[PDB]
Amino acid sequence: MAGPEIVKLKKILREKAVPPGTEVPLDVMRKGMEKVAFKAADDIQVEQVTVAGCAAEWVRAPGCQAGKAILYLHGGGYVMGSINTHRSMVGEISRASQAAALLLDYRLAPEHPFPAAVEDGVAAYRWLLDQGFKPQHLSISGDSAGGGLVLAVLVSARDQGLPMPASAIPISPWADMTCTNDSFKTRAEADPMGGINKMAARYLNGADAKHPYASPNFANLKGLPPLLIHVGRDEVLLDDSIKLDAKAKADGVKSTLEIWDDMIHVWHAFHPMLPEGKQAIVRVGEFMREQWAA
Q: Which residue of the set 57, 92, 119, 235 is catalytic?
């Protein structure tokens, strides 16, 4: 039974959606995402750094433990999103997990197609290791495209001999560039948030959409550290997450999948107005904390 904040938030999102099959130019979506982005809580401090040739910020809520870090990989379909767009949500993930996040401005398509984003994530993780963070004091998390990227970064790191961090948390992961899953049809009407194919097209630029590093639902996941996967019941990507879970489990990975009833794509990001957003983020940070104490 839907809380009143989600019902209202859904109505607002349908109210301001661009009608299906309007072609919005890239630079227009990019700017829209920036201008609507939530301001981080005033107790979030930030520090600008350069990491593997990318802009980044250390994002530190109050209560951050020395020695702990999150590599955070933002969504935006591999084509948009930035530090600015995700600073707020990431501030709250830092609060809940009592760890600073490294929020990476990785290379975006179409200017930098696949595998540029995977290269940046692996180099950023390598960077954290070089700075002296122990793999057992590290976590990787990301939303949407960023959540698939979490998985791609792990796989690529694993293949290159890097140690696995203590946990990974994909949020609403887009882990299948082919976009063929049942839930693109079964969940379409419930999801107020095609356009996603155009992003796959821009990211791939010719590459096999079943490349394990583009679509980690087709990767070998053996060796990956324990996963929390968040996904909403009312989202077209439900299937990416159910399938990623069963893959991980097949492959010997400790997976925990939570499907949140009534929730939409990255409902986390609506935390200031959605109780379930605040709730899901508290859960993400609890899980990073559990995994770091085990």
A: 235
